[PDB]
């Protein structure tokens, strides 16, 4: 019927002045654009069909052609930036927002989808969607006593589109748009659907990826305990954005970091720091490095939760970029911690895997490790036990690597090495 039409035939029907002929041709374009194997988006654009699709969005008395056009335009908007731009240039943004209030749920859902693709292109189209007034009708679709009464596919599309309005930087979304979206987002973050939960966490991870003021807007809505709960989910599509959000929050102030600790997040990190998915381990270790950059009472909580052995573990064996986050974790720890906390680090076995990483060719991890060694020696000087640390570094081959780095291209790997040799190995 409408399967495998030529673009020429589609143009012919759409250019007829017969609404039923145009409906059939539009559905045929929708089916062409729905195939996974290179949908001919550019050929449809080059045929000049986008203005006609957009005008069909307004045919209130022919809801089928509204749906088919909406679907066709959604899939053009799903392509490259240039292809999304063609949809925007055709006037689709206000026409889709007008469809949000359609009495046909499948048509308003398709308008939700299309705006999600347009907003997802980048911050400019995101902010342009916001300026046309998309947020109010979107949130009104979710203004129900219980989200569970909404169709699951519909709720997932609404959640995903809302998270694209939260997405991207330079610039971040407008402050007032974020404040307007946040209470609905908090409610979606407590819903029981795994996809809604994943996309809600993604939205929160975008909003917390910024300055401390952006983090605070989220943290003050009280979502940190729910994020920590989702941190323990069995669904990796949920854990990944939940962890990104938690890690984003601990890039903020010590007070914002403390609320992550208060919420019980550190008890999940034995699993996260041994998680089979290397990017979970990397993100978890980066998060740990920002926690060990906090106060001494926050370092103490890391100790209390038994997490220093887990840092020794990832330093000993992990993907290199995780090992580098672990190196940062130790340097931050030794920079801010007490003498007793630093001594405990040595007792857990940090020295030998620390020395082994001086073999790496990454020059700034060598700088990071050399700073941690200097920090630990400074703690050992306060105790009069510099020589035991010297011999410890000696027996694991660490001294050989320190004096090897005396022969290094970088000017500070140069001097840090010789300085440590000068003062502690004479």
């Amino acid at each position: 019927g409408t399967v495998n039409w030529s673009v020429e035939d589609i143009v012919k029907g759409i250019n007829s002045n017969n609404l039923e002929s145009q409906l059939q041709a539009t559905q045929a374009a929708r089916k062409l654009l729905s195939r996974e194997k290179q949908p001919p988006i550019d050929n449809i654009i080059r045929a000049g069909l986008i203005p006609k699709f957009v005008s069909f969005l307004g045919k209130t008395d022919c809801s089928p052609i509204q749906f088919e056009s909406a679907w066709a335009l959604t899939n053009i908007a799903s392509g490259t930036s240039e292809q999304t731009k063609a949809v925007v240039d055709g006037g689709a943004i206000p026409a889709f927002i007008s469809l949000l209030a359609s009495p046909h749920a499948h048509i308003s859902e398709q308008a939700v989808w299309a705006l999600g693709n347009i907003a997802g292109d980048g911050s400019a189209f995101r902010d342009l969607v916001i300026k046309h007034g998309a947020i109010d009708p979107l949130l009104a679709l979710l203004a129900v006593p219980d989200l569970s009464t909404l169709a699951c596919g519909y709720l997932r599309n609404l959640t995903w589109t809302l998270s694209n309005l939260c997405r991207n930087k330079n610039p971040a979304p407008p402050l007032d748009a974020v404040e307007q979206i946040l209470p609905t987002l908090v409610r979606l973050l407590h819903h029981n659907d795994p996809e809604v939960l994943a996309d809600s966490c993604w939205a929160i991870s975008y909003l917390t990826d910024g300055p401390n003021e952006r983090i605070e807007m989220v943290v003050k809505k009280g979502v940190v305990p729910q994020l920590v709960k989702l941190l323990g989910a069995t669904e990796l599509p949920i854990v990944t954005p939940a962890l990104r959000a938690i890690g984003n929050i601990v890039t903020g102030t010590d007070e914002q970091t403390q609320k992550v600790i208060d919420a019980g997040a550190l008890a999940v990190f034995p699993s996260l720091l041994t998680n089979p998915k290397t990017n979970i381990q990397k993100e978890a270790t980066w998060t740990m490095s920002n926690i060990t950059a906090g106060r001494q009472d926050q370092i103490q909580q890391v100790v209390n939760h038994g997490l220093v052995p887990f840092l020794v573990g990832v330093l000993s064996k992990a993907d290199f970029k995780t090992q580098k986050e672990a190196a940062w974790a130790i340097t931050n720890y030794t920079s801010g911690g007490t003498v007793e906390q630093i001594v405990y680090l040595v007792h857990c076995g940090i020295i030998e895997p620390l020395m082994n990483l001086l073999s790496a060719k990454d020059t700034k991890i060598i700088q990071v490790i050399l700073d941690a060694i200097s920090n630990i020696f400074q703690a050992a000087e306060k105790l009069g036990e510099t020589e035991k640390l010297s011999i410890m570094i000696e027996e694991c081959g660490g001294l050989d690597k320190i004096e090897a780095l005396q022969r290094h291209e970088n000017e500070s790997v140069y001097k840090a090495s010789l300085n440590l040799i000068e003062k502690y190995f004479s």
Partner: peptide, 9 residues
């Protein structure tokens, strides 16, 4: 506030 904090690298 805390200068030791690091963003993603």
């Amino acid at each position: 506030s805390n200068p030791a904090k690091r963003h993603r690298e």
